[PDB]
Write a protein that binds this DNA or RNA. Structure first.
Ligand SMILES: [K+]
Ligand SMILES: [K+]
Ligand SMILES: [K+]
Ligand SMILES: [Mg+2]
Ligand SMILES: [Mg+2]
Ligand SMILES: [Mg+2]
Ligand SMILES: [Mg+2]
Ligand SMILES: [Mg+2]
Ligand SMILES: [Mg+2]
Ligand SMILES: [Mg+2]
Lengths: 170, 121, 173, 94, 306
RNA sequence: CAAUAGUUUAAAGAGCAACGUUAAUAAACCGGAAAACUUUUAACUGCACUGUGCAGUUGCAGGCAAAGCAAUGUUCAGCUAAAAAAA
């Protein structure tokens, strides 16, 4: 006439860290953000746990991307050669050469800006997500010196000595 | 994103140099961009094909406002330019000094895709 | 806890422009070091508690860079000397929480709230603070857990000169 | 001050302070100090300082309301505070 | 609020006994039904139950065509059946769902009493879904998980929006305002006229004015379910969802879908029976070309040449 | 509000915004009263609280760390300190 409830088991015997996906230098967490509130040793806010849940998902996607691609650690002021696929033109491959004028390091949302000048048409700027699958390769080919951001902005507005390659290859 | 009554630079060899938008076609909204056809008035021309004071049709080829692609990237130019067209839909010149973008891969711009010097695709 | 605002740094506005706001907080921070206990309004006390904790952190650093930053905050030479020598040794093992705040009711004239701000380890302290390093029972789950997660847990106060420095001096001499 | 003065009066008359109830309270007008303050464009206004009298009457076993307030102790400061003796080793267990 | 209570009177001795006998007879109920969990056929007019979830935030991904897709993440902590309604006692059939978890000493005894009586955890939120037939009732305690949905379907979301505070007409209703120059005097952001003159002589109800803005119930229809993670109780939905982080969101099969579409999806009915732990992560497949307009003329072009 | 553009130096992967993103062409959607039903010893402040508390004691947007900086880790601060012995 007595019904005993079921007690859940422990996933990792004698291990105090669940083993969630985090960056190498970050101290390891002690819980899984998707675990139900009822089964937690510490009852932390749902709102704070949802922020931690998104960080874990971002790191999982970043790990998969790094296994697929290997790009160099370029900086602002370097000249780059970028291989891209044009989905509009039946997924054809082209190679672009230009100067890197802006770089944002924001995890999975990282991006950079590529600048080039043509013989008659003038300057042309592109904004490219770094983790976009359309990009196939990136290489460093040179460097352009600048003093500060103001100097770099003046150079962009006044198109000069930025005509590495006149047209796109392939 | 060009509102009405904006000034444009002509990048063909028909003779016109400066035009002003005076009208739109259809329902594009409050502004127009690359790939749309507008009505313009010629302000400065040096040639026999066209003269100042006339009204012509034109197509936007370059703009400084970001142009977005489905993959999340975008690009920008450093000028606003257009190409004059005839009532039949063909250019009034035979040489365009501009960078053609993906908008003109469409079948209706075959003539422009032939007379343009540099193409991004 | 101290509320966080939307302005740069999340600090209080103290009903003052930024220039006058910084001049005021620097003066009060100097007096806190000199006297170690001050009674003021709640808003000035909350800001002073958070600002005071970060000033002690500079003193513990004991570096040329830290001293340069502190030399622009403290107003008196005697107060700056005390910060790097006396308070630096006092809070060697304490990890944060060097200042406490206790509310003390309302004033008489304008009925403003007030509080008392004090340092947390000294003679004359309002209360007795917990030890800087928490002792760990020898047969407790806590001891086993810390070994598995942080082998470098500190259980007792450490000497001024660690054994490695002492051994080097002995070998040298 | 009025409440304390009235209770002292009750004790002199031989009443029990533990059964007193506030049965009547009201105010009364005093003598005012009149004044004037200038306004714009040559107009003038009033500037008056008011005064009032207060009367309190305490009676035994009068009809009273049931309101009662909860009481708590203040912050413990000094040798009477023992929050520093807490043992935090228990919270690491299951 | 409520109106003042109406007076009551004792019944005459010749009628009191009769009234009590009849009232008791009407308030006597039979045994509670015992639902059985078994797959059922889907009919042209048959509604399923929804679920209660928590909003986590937004992210993005690239699809098989290389297109960027904005996504909103919803987490299902613990959703269970906590009660039933049936015709004999209430006049209609419904299923009550609860989600969340709270401590006993943080809620009123009235709320905690219901859950303790049936050996269920105290849940933070409770919501009712109406069913079509008694056979659609689920046994009390059944779990509603992420496997309840089929990847690639359309869903509706409901919730309370983000609180914005006291705002003016320009931000609350988009009024134009008045010129910044040319003699304007202290009326740059004011609503302007609010009526006429002696006729009609009053201000109409629901005239738009300043006030509080941002805490109201809103519904979005026809969002697409992009990815499903049954093991971790996650749903990825394309588009925007009302409410800030932590808001409670109700998820339901969209009413925009026809019966044929539901049959094609083969939605679980009454719900998914099994263990969701041993299920893989699935992403919907779109048999469409986002770049078709570059090969064929399908776009909008107002001008006809010649 | 993931991304893109603008905006704050006690700064920033902050917050708010559209020039940005998603959805709608319906017996759908939203508001207040209230029958009936259910639960209770018939309920009733508060986290600096003029943003939000979907945070009430291993609770926390303070402090501190090698850390993505309203997240992760944490021995300190404040609100609110705990235990029969033995078998
Ligand atoms: K600091
Ligand atoms: K009306
Ligand atoms: K959203
Ligand atoms: Mg005068
Ligand atoms: Mg205006
Ligand atoms: Mg005037
Ligand atoms: Mg004005
Ligand atoms: Mg009037
Ligand atoms: Mg926001
Ligand atoms: Mg902090």
């Amino acid at each position: 006439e007595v019904i005993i409830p079921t007690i859940p088991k422990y996933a990792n015997p004698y291990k105090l860290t669940p083993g969630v996906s985090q960056r190498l230098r970050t101290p390891k967490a002690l819980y899984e953000p998707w675990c139900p509130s009822r089964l937690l040793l510490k009852k932390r806010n749902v709102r704070a746990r949802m922020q931690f849940l998104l960080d874990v998902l971002e790191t999982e996607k970043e790990v998969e991307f790094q296994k697929q691609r290997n790009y160099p650690d370029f900086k602002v002021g370097d000249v780059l050669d970028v291989t891209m696929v044009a989905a509009e033109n039946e997924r054809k491959t082209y190679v672009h050469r230009g100067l890197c004028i802006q770089k944002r390091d924001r995890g999975y949302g990282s991006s950079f800006k590529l600048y080039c000048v043509f013989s008659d048409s003038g300057g042309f700027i592109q904004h490219l997500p770094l983790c976009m699958p359309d990009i196939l390769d990136i290489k460093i080919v040179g460097q352009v010196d600048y003093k500060d951001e103001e100097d770099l902005k003046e150079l962009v507005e006044s198109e000069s000595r930025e005509c590495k390659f006149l047209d796109k290859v392939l | 994103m060009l509102p009405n009554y904006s000034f444009l630079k002509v990048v063909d060899n028909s003779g016109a140099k400066l035009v002003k938008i005076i009208g739109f076609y259809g329902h594009p909204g409050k502004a127009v961009g690359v790939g749309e056809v507008v009505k313009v008035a010629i302000k400065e021309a040096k040639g026999e094909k066209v003269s100042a004071g006339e009204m012509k049709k034109a197509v936007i080829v370059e703009q400084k406002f970001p142009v977005f692609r489905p993959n999340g990237s975008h690009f920008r130019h450093l000028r606003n330019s257009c190409v004059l067209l005839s009532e039949k839909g063909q250019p009034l010149g035979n040489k365009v000094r501009a960078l053609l973008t993906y908008e003109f891969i469409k079948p209706r711009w075959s003539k422009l895709r032939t007379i343009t010097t540099k193409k991004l695709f | 806890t101290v509320k966080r605002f939307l302005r740069p740094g999340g600090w209080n506005r103290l009903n003052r422009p930024v220039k006058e706001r910084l001049a005021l907080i620097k003066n009060m921070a100097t007096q806190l070091v000199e006297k170690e206990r001050i009674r003021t309004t709640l808003s000035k006390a909350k800001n002073l508690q958070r600002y005071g904790d970060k000033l002690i952190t500079l003193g513990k650093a004991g570096t040329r860079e830290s001293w340069l930053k502190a030399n622009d905050i403290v107003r008196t030479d005697r107060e700056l000397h005390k910060l790097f020598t006396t308070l630096a040794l006092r809070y060697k093992d304490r990890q944060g929480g060097y200042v406490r705040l206790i509310r003390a009711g309302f004033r008489r004239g304008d009925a403003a709230p007030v509080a008392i701000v004090e340092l947390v380890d000294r003679e004359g302290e309002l209360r007795q603070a917990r030890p800087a390093v928490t002792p760990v029972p020898k047969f407790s789950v806590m001891r086993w857990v810390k070994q598995q997660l942080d082998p470098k847990f500190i259980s007792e106060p450490a000497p001024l000169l660690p054994p490695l420095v002492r051994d080097y001096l002995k070998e040298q001499n | 001050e009025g409440l304390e003065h009235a209770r002292k009066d009750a004790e002199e008359k031989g009443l029990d302070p533990k059964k007193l109830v506030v049965s009547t309270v009201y105010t009364a007008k005093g003598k005012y100090l009149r004044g004037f303050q200038p306004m714009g464009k040559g107009f003038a206004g009033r500037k008056t300082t008011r005064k009032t009298h207060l009367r309190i009457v305490l009676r035994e076993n009068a009809s009273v309301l049931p309101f009662a307030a909860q009481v708590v102790s203040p912050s413990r400061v000094g040798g009477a505070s023992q929050k520093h003796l807490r043992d935090i080793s228990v919270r690491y267990t299951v | 609020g409520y109106r003042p209570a109406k007076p009551v009177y004792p019944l005459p001795d010749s009628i009191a006994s009769l009234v009590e006998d009849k009232i008791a007879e009407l308030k006597k109920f039979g045994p509670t039904p015992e639902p059985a969990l078994e797959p059922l056929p889907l009919t042209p007019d048959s509604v399923r139950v929804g679920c209660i979830t928590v909003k986590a935030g937004m992210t993005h991904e690239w699809d098989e065509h290389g297109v960027m897709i904005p996504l909103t993440v919803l987490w299902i902590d613990e959703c269970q059946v906590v009660g039933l309604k049936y015709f004999e006692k209430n006049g209609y059939y419904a299923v009550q769902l609860g989600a969340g978890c709270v401590k006993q000493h943080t809620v009123l005894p009235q709320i905690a009493g219901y859950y303790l009586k049936h050996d269920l955890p105290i849940k933070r939120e409770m919501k009712e879904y109406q069913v079509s037939s008694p056979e659609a009732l689920l046994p009390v305690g059944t779990h509603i998980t992420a496997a309840h949905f089929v990847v690639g379907q359309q869903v509706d979301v409901t919730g309370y929006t983000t609180d914005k505070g006291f705002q003016g007409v320009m931000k609350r209703w988009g009024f134009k305002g008045m010129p910044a120059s040319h003699g304007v005097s202290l009326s740059h952001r004011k609503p302007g006229a609010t009526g006429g003159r002696q006729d009609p002589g009053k201000i109409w109800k629901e005239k738009k004015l300043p006030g509080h803005m941002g805490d109201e119930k809103r519904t979005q229809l026809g969002l697409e379910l992009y990815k499903v993670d049954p093991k971790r109780n996650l749903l990825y939905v394309k588009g925007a969802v009302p409410g800030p982080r932590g808001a409670s969101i109700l998820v339901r099969d969209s009413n925009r879908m026809d019966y044929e579409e539901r049959v094609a999806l083969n939605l679980p009915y009454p719900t998914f029976i099994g263990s969701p732990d041993e299920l893989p992560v699935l992403v919907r497949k779109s048999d469409k070309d986002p770049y078709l307009m570059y090969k064929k003329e399908i776009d909008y072009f107002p001008i006809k040449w010649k």
